Amino acid sequence: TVRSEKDSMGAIDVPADKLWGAQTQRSLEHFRISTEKMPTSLIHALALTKRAAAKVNEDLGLLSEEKASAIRQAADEVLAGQHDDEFPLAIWQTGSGTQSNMNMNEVLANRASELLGGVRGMERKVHPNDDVNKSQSSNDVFPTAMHVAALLALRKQLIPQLKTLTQTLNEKSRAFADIVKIGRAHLQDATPLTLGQEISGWVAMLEHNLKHIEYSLPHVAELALGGTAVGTGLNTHPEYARRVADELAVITCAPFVTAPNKFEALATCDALVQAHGALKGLAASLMKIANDVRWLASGPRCGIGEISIPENEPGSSIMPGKVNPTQCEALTMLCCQVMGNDVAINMGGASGNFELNVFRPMVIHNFLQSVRLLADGMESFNKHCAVGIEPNRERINQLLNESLMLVTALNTHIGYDKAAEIAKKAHKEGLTLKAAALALGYLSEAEFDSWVRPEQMVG
Amino acid sequence: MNTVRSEKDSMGAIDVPADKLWGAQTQRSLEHFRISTEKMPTSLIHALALTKRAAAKVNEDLGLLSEEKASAIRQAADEVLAGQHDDEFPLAIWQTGSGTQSNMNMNEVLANRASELLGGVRGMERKVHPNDDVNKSQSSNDVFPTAMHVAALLALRKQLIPQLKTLTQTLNEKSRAFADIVKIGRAHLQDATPLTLGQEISGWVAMLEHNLKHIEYSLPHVAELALGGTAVGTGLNTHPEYARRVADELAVITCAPFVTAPNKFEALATCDALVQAHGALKGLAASLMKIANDVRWLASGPRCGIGEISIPENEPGSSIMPGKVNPTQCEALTMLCCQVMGNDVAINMGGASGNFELNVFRPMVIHNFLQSVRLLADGMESFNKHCAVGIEPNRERINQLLNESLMLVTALNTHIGYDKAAEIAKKAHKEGLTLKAAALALGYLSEAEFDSWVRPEQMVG
Amino acid sequence: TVRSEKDSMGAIDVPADKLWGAQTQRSLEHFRISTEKMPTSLIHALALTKRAAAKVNEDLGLLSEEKASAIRQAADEVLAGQHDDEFPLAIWQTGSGTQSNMNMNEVLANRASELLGGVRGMERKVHPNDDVNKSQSSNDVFPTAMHVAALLALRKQLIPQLKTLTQTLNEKSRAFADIVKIGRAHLQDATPLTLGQEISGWVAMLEHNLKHIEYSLPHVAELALGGTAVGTGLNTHPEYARRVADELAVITCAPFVTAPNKFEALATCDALVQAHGALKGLAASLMKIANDVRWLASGPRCGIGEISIPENEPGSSIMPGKVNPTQCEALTMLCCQVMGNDVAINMGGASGNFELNVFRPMVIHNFLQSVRLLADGMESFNKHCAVGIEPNRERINQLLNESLMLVTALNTHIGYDKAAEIAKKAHKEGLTLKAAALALGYLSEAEFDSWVRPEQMVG
Amino acid sequence: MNTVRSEKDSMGAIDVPADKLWGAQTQRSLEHFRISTEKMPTSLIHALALTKRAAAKVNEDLGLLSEEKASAIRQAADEVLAGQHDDEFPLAIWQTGSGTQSNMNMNEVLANRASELLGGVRGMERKVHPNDDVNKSQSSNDVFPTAMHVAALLALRKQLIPQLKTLTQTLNEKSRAFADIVKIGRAHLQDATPLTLGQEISGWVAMLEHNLKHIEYSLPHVAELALGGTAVGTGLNTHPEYARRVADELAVITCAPFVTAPNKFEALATCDALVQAHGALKGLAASLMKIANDVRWLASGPRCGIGEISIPENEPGSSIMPGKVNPTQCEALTMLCCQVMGNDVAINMGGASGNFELNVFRPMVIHNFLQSVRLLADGMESFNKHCAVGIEPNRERINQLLNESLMLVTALNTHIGYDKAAEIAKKAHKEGLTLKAAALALGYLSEAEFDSWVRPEQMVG
């Protein structure tokens, strides 16, 4: 049920049905903290990093073809979801990510050995440090995997969902471009605008956020691999750093480059501090959009009620028409999460010392969580709420025409004094503007209808 | 004034303005830390003056300082406390992280002024000396944290807690006045089963009562003073009774329960008491944010919002816009609540960043802490007098919303059964009717029965 | 492989081998956001809440004995770890926690039905809403479970580990009470103190933190259950709120009480905002302690090196004596996490509206994570680092006696001018204080040894 | 001055100090928002004056305002910009959340002063009118966000970016000067394989270069101006060319690339551009924190720390304490970096909290944003001139640490093999020896061979 594996500290029992080795087993004794583990995106990015390193080491004559090919095959099995239970280590580990680096080295070595006709364990044909970790340090591998996971997640998950939600809201803005509604400023009734114009503000917000996120991508694409222990690249081939970045770009189809300054790359998490700045911007914009949606949908009788949203959860037959804005609640909650995650990242990023930042597992745990939250939240809000936003046209018109805000349309036809007198009488006596104007005898019903045109007050 | 006076320290001579009372170390700090515009607040300047006044009294008691000098230093400190020397403290928050430079600012100003009070002059011929006399038995390392806690505890006791109690009393009065006014509930922003306006306000009251207890729990730790720890916490170069005596003297002159810190290493190496006390303040900020938001949403209108309450109108409006009242006190309060949340993060980072024997993030920590206390105290004072005391219900609007809602339908269940009550509610929702109109249209009851049976005052417990 | 369950929205297929029902299945369609789920502590607290509600409903004659007993048995199975895979829902759900409330209602009803000789599904003998949710709302159940989980986690995990770490450091402080070392202020050499005194500062910090955490417990012990939908308790028995709090106190052995104001209890997360304030205080104290440990252990040759710590991970045979402070790295990282979690909690807690705060899943996700991180982090730091702290006595003495800081011991024997002259000569020429004093002929070697006593300079 | 002047608004009459230029709405705000001590910063006051100067010019171009009045308003605004009226702006940050009251403060001061410039008087007989003339074509809702972006973009362009470039140049000079000085590496705080001091400093340089690019990426969005959106974004009651014309005029007079916001609803309902730009500033704060910490740790000593570099000594020391230099510039800089992190949270909360057509957290957002810019700009300026320009290596100490370390042992591998090199390192560690002493004791090489083979200058790439 167990096998005996060894490292420089001695022998330790490892579960026979697992592919990790002595160092991963020791880490399970020493970092038993909470429940957060490396996310799949990061495990995959680590496997890609090892796949690329093995290819380059083979190209340079440093690693045999049979070993490099077997390591790549084992890495491909990880990427294909065959080894999810082989990565048991906590986020809350050595701050360089050494323990997860060695977790990947051991799993890939033991599995590659089997692919070459050997066994897992100390009789293995492929070796975690001498083969799988060749030319590498934990110090440069972990930040490489951080940036690979971050850039691919932004490109493949977050940006597509942002574009999809933007397109939905742009369609709604055009569909509702002629629906005049009351403005609200300071929460008070205000000058009118169209529902389409209000939604166009949400659209422009998401378009601006996309640009800010795109501006953060070039720095995240810079990779530390090749800096080795402290940034000098001591005892590596002069072409290794460029070659491994090129190979990662090939296999991922993304524009990875080697970091021009390896000391900045090892000593900081600056690219991720900056990129997460754009994500907390998106979180503040999504919070505002989600709040507008839920407030505009509030009711069905004692709130605003200008729009309806899809009803996705069962309700009580004695409470028909009550629709809780549950997608808005999930989205506003995760937006608060992103703001907190930004603080954790900022503290970690501010806390490097000398040649190495050792707050890395926590930084990437927060960053990749924010990406999942924002991408999946935008997907869910789009599919289950935004695509179904519809106006309540009678309620919109009732609020608009019963308000006091259209009174300025009378200024050019009668006095400002008379228009103001009409509004004051309406407010004091609970009348519409039309009823107050007729009672004062300042105009005809025909004149009011001709002169007070909300569709001429939105430009 | 253009004319200068030459002042000296261990580094040499430097020119200071002839009409000012500070000395060489203040002038160097003024010239070397030209960073932004934030300076020590008056509360902290006063706390430093109190600390020097107490230290002079105890040094005299112990035979270490002459009566002549001790009395003159106390007189100079009382002038600072009386507001006569605000322009003598020009230094930035963004200075040395121990607050050494502001300690020396007080030492120099008090020495030069005490010299004049003894018939002498300011400058290098002074009769009283900043380090040998005004800083006797002290270090910057233990003086600045002492002044931090003196300023913090007095601000909490004399400004924040009284204003919190006052706002709580006002809202308790409103809760009692409106105890019989039934209104629609709102959960998830959706219409919900009713409660009274008094019950809703009682929630705000209970929040403020809980916050007071949390703030009170933080006061004993802030009352612990570092003075007597000297440079690294061991008390080297102090009389064995000095730490206790100076805490006692500060307690006498401030009428606050200051005590010497039982562990001077914790007192010098951390800002932990302020990290914890500010945790209670960010709790109060979250509660005030919610209360302020309820007030402004409930007052929203005049015709396209909720409009269940009115608030006092303090700012001019437009003649052509009767009935519009911007909730400006609510806006100031929600803004400062956000400020307190950010200040908490700055404090937490400074508090987490001590090294070995000394935390050197102190000016920044106290700048944020005292700002949060001013904002919460003055914000509650302003919100109370300019909004809370004048909150009133709009009774007709409250009843209109309640009677137009679908949420009173369960009052029918005991009379006609669940199935028919649900049928009425569904018809009312689908057809845009009141519950009464839907019930009459189906023939399930009369108007008199509806009015007899549907009683909101029986639906609030 | 599936069964058909029903709610008010219609029929939906549910996996036959699962115990949840229609509403939980719908939630899996609508809240597919990230990977964070309710933690075990919260699932258990929900089960305890349902167990207590069923007991009280039976006492009041509202629920049959056979149904109440079967519900309690099913809840006990959850608490015993038999149903961990029956709670699949995301944190990022309806902000009142309705979906997780219904998850518990459905699992307990389907399982209780089996315990009464029935089946799971629509033929069940026990009903999720009419039986398991009797006398309750999601609005008051979820905050009750939040406070039950929070108070029990603070009492059973965090406070014991805090006391254990404090005891270890108190023992180290006493053991090292006579070891004089150089002080450090502003990172510069400073007046001496003992290693025991320095550690006593850490101890006093942890003692103060325990008091602050204890002060937060009475508010967390207040429970919302009995306030029902909006706080009025409409259509509940007048004794129900007190009875359910009493029953929770009995079964958990903790001092739960009914909240004296149910409107504060439903409309806010104030108790948890305040309690988390004390946890971020602990995080700032632990950050400082962990940093002192790793800096004091830094080296082995080019840092401070005044203490040694246990070596828990393998190293390279060509780098003997290098010991990375990996427990300090895990602890400082999780302390940053707690600071970020506090911001997320503060935003959620500030964001209630009217009768209900609907940021609750996110608030409790953060709060319970901080408790796990701090409790497990203190356990790990204690077991794997603090218990093994030892002084490097020769290095401590070398730094102390080669510094310039002991010079003030000469002030009372010779001039201050002469002592200052000795220190300046030592600094300019790279000498010890003793060598400089002898070169100036200001004292004998015997006088220096008699007069310069570090053990007399620490009080 | 005790004597008053009666000023009027729509609400009635109120007394203002006779020697002041503001009017009734400023006086009401001053009296109703007595909250703490933070006021509008001078940069924002100047941006509001620039906005009114540009609006007057365009209104005159469009035939909407007489040449007489437009020229007088521009003259009054230029007086504000020249620093002649700082005491005419007394209002708190903690005011109405749209900044209406500070908009009116500028309208009233400029109208009363422009009246005097036309031969008239201040007060109700004035020749120029705050709302009809100075606020013509404008709303508070679009003026205050415009002034926010004008102040923010000019502060970034004229203060922050130049100081960032200057500090970067200094550190690049140091990196080149020290390119040949090999020192011990430190990873996890543990001794590590070597690098040059120039290489280590090149990391700081590269950080500051990256930060400059990130800040530059944020400038186009801040350059978008809300002016012309009026009350809710539709531009009702403006000439169709007004929004473009006023952005063009602001671009001319400031020499900065201001443009009208393509979507006025986004411009009025959010502070998104400032949320994003402040994200780049908190990035810079994290980088500066790391650089400042490296400097102070590397300079720590004089005898019980690292001590690889020296820094300028700017503050007096104790005669009895030669060689001790507190890193006070590093302490001021690390403190303000914490402040920027907290300010970011306050900004994020305000930015997330817009409702419908208007974000009303604006005074708080701009107070934090402009503070962060002052702190980072002035902090970099101060750190550069008072610390960075004078950083020097301690060459003997650098070499002592390098030669006493165990981390040069791999230079032996090619000569004697891994096994013997590892044996030497283990013996040196266990017995407290240098690598050379351990190698000689085992008889594995001579002293001349060790000196020939162990070359740190060959171990840095």
Side-chain angles (χ1 to χ4, degrees), chain A residues 263-285:
Chain A
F263 311 97
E264 179 264 354
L266 287 186
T268 80
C269 296
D270 283 355
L272 294 177
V273 177
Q274 289 282 354
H276 203 270
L279 300 183
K280 57 86 166 190
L282 176 63
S285 297

Side-chain angles (χ1 to χ4, degrees), chain B residues 98 186 188 200 202 210-211 214 221 224 234 263 272 275-276 280 282 287 290 294 344 348 356-357, chain C residues 96 184 186 198 200 208-209 212 219 222 261 270 273-274 278 280 285 288 292 342-343 346 354-355 459:
Chain B
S98 58
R186 287 177 184 85
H188 303 260
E200 190 173 58
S202 85
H210 277 283
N211 275 286
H214 288 296
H221 193 179
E224 299 186 358
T234 61
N263 189 286
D272 282 358
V275 175
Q276 291 278 356
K282 59 85 163 189
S287 297
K290 202 270 178 183
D294 278 0
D344 194 76
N348 293 346
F356 318 113
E357 282 52 78
Chain C
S96 51
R184 287 179 184 84
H186 303 261
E198 190 172 62
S200 85
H208 275 284
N209 275 285
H212 288 293
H219 196 177
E222 296 188 359
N261 190 286
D270 283 355
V273 177
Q274 289 282 354
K280 57 86 166 190
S285 297
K288 203 274 181 180
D292 280 359
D342 194 74
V343 171
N346 294 346
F354 317 113
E355 283 51 79

Side-chain angles (χ1 to χ4, degrees), chain C residues 57 63 67 71 125-134:
Chain C
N57 279 324
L63 180 65
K67 282 185 168 184
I71 291 162
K125 293 173 174 287
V126 183
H127 301 288
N129 185 60
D130 289 342
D131 298 326
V132 190
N133 209 54
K134 177 183 298 295

Side-chain angles (χ1 to χ4, degrees), chain D residues 43-273:
Chain D
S43 59
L44 191 284
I45 295 306
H46 285 191
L48 279 166
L50 287 162
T51 301
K52 298 299 176 173
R53 194 196 199 273
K57 195 265 184 183
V58 172
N59 278 327
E60 187 200 341
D61 286 348
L62 295 173
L64 304 176
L65 181 67
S66 77
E67 192 281 332
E68 180 167 321
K69 290 181 167 184
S71 172
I73 293 168
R74 292 196 289 279
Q75 287 171 26
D78 286 346
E79 290 182 359
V80 175
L81 293 167
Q84 300 170 25
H85 300 299
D86 288 340
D87 302 338
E88 308 288 350
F89 303 93
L91 299 190
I93 291 302
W94 322 105
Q95 66 172 245
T96 178
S98 58
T100 287
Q101 288 159 8
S102 280
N103 183 43
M104 287 304 315
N105 189 354
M106 189 62 68
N107 288 330
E108 291 177 340
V109 168
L110 296 187
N112 273 336
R113 179 61 180 142
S115 180
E116 290 178 342
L117 287 166
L118 294 176
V121 298
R122 68 185 71 178
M124 298 318 299
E125 299 310 305
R126 51 193 165 226
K127 294 173 101 173
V128 181
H129 299 285
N131 186 64
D132 283 319
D133 300 327
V134 188
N135 212 53
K136 182 181 290 302
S137 309
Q138 299 155 71
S139 170
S140 288
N141 295 351
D142 69 342
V143 170
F144 200 82
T146 296
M148 287 168 70
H149 282 193
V150 169
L153 187 69
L154 296 184
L156 291 165
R157 284 167 58 91
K158 298 169 62 58
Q159 289 101 53
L160 194 146
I161 289 170
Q163 299 305 334
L164 176 55
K165 289 175 172 172
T166 291
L167 176 58
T168 306
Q169 178 186 314
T170 297
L171 293 179
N172 194 56
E173 293 164 1
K174 297 286 176 176
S175 172
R176 288 168 63 80
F178 310 148
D180 53 27
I181 302 177
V182 185
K183 49 157 280 168
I184 197 70
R186 287 177 184 85
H188 303 260
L189 315 181
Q190 295 286 105
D191 312 343
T193 43
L195 74 170
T196 70
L197 181 55
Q199 278 167 335
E200 190 173 58
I201 298 175
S202 85
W204 310 342
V205 173
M207 294 156 71
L208 297 179
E209 293 171 338
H210 277 283
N211 275 286
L212 174 60
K213 292 188 179 63
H214 288 296
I215 293 162
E216 288 168 341
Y217 301 151
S218 76
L219 303 184
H221 193 179
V222 180
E224 299 186 358
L225 300 185
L227 206 57
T230 58
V232 300
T234 61
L236 186 71
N237 310 310
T238 67
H239 190 283
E241 302 172 30
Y242 167 86
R244 183 52 180 289
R245 282 171 177 270
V246 69
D248 282 348
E249 175 66 6
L250 278 165
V252 166
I253 65 180
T254 65
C255 305
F258 291 111
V259 304
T260 201
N263 189 286
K264 293 301 190 300
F265 309 96
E266 179 261 355
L268 291 184
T270 82
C271 301
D272 282 358

Side-chain angles (χ1 to χ4, degrees), chain A residues 198 270 285 288 346 354-355, chain D residues 200 272 282 287 356-357:
Chain A
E198 190 172 62
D270 283 355
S285 297
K288 203 274 181 180
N346 294 346
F354 317 113
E355 283 51 79
Chain D
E200 190 173 58
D272 282 358
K282 59 85 163 189
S287 297
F356 318 113
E357 282 52 78

Side-chain angles (χ1 to χ4, degrees), chain C residues 203-453:
Chain C
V203 172
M205 291 156 72
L206 299 179
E207 291 174 336
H208 275 284
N209 275 285
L210 174 63
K211 292 184 190 92
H212 288 293
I213 293 162
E214 288 170 337
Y215 302 154
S216 75
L217 302 182
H219 196 177
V220 180
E222 296 188 359
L223 302 181
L225 208 55
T228 79
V230 300
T232 59
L234 177 65
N235 224 27
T236 64
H237 193 284
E239 304 186 342
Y240 168 89
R242 179 189 47 90
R243 281 176 178 264
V244 292
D246 279 351
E247 175 67 6
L248 278 164
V250 167
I251 65 180
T252 69
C253 293
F256 291 110
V257 303
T258 201
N261 190 286
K262 292 301 189 301
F263 311 97
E264 179 264 354
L266 287 186
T268 80
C269 296
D270 283 355
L272 294 177
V273 177
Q274 289 282 354
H276 203 270
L279 300 183
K280 57 86 166 190
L282 176 63
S285 297
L286 288 170
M287 186 94 77
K288 203 274 181 180
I289 293 162
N291 276 332
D292 280 359
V293 168
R294 63 167 167 187
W295 284 106
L296 291 173
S298 59
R301 304 264 175 110
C302 299
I304 290 173
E306 285 177 355
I307 68 180
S308 63
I309 55 165
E311 183 176 354
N312 301 321
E313 284 79 47
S316 168
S317 60
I318 203 144
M319 285 172 281
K322 178 169 81 65
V323 180
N324 288 335
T326 57
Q327 295 292 318
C328 300
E329 293 168 2
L331 181 52
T332 56
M333 279 194 301
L334 69 86
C335 282
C336 290
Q337 191 67 56
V338 173
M339 303 304 189
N341 291 1
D342 194 74
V343 171
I345 288 168
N346 294 346
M347 292 191 53
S351 295
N353 295 113
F354 317 113
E355 283 51 79
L356 197 63
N357 182 297
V358 293
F359 287 74
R360 293 177 171 286
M362 179 277 297
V363 167
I364 198 65
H365 162 74
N366 281 277
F367 190 94
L368 296 173
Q369 183 187 83
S370 299
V371 177
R372 293 193 303 276
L373 292 174
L374 292 165
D376 293 353
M378 286 187 293
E379 194 281 317
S380 190
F381 183 77
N382 180 251
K383 175 178 285 304
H384 303 304
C385 185
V387 296
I389 289 166
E390 293 293 336
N392 288 321
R393 285 173 181 85
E394 281 187 20
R395 171 65 161 184
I396 285 168
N397 269 325
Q398 176 245 305
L399 293 180
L400 181 66
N401 292 296
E402 296 182 348
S403 81
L404 306 163
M405 290 301 313
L406 298 181
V407 78
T408 60
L410 302 173
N411 284 12
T412 193
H413 306 278
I414 67 189
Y416 170 97
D417 303 348
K418 293 74 183 211
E421 180 177 355
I422 289 162
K424 183 178 179 180
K425 185 185 176 63
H427 179 247
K428 183 178 179 180
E429 303 173 19
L431 304 179
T432 56
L433 292 175
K434 174 183 261 193
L438 294 170
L440 287 162
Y442 286 169
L443 50 63
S444 164
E445 299 105 311
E447 286 166 326
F448 191 95
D449 296 342
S450 80
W451 294 344
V452 187
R453 308 310 316 158

Side-chain angles (χ1 to χ4, degrees), chain A residues 47 50-51 54 63 66-76 108-109 112 115 126-127 131-133:
Chain A
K50 300 296 174 176
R51 191 194 206 277
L63 180 65
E66 76 170 359
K67 282 185 168 184
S69 173
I71 291 162
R72 295 191 298 268
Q73 292 170 238
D76 288 345
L108 296 186
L115 288 165
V126 183
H127 301 288
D131 298 326
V132 190
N133 209 54

Side-chain angles (χ1 to χ4, degrees), chain A residues 125-136:
Chain A
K125 293 173 174 287
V126 183
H127 301 288
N129 185 60
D130 289 342
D131 298 326
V132 190
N133 209 54
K134 177 183 298 295
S135 303
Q136 299 154 72

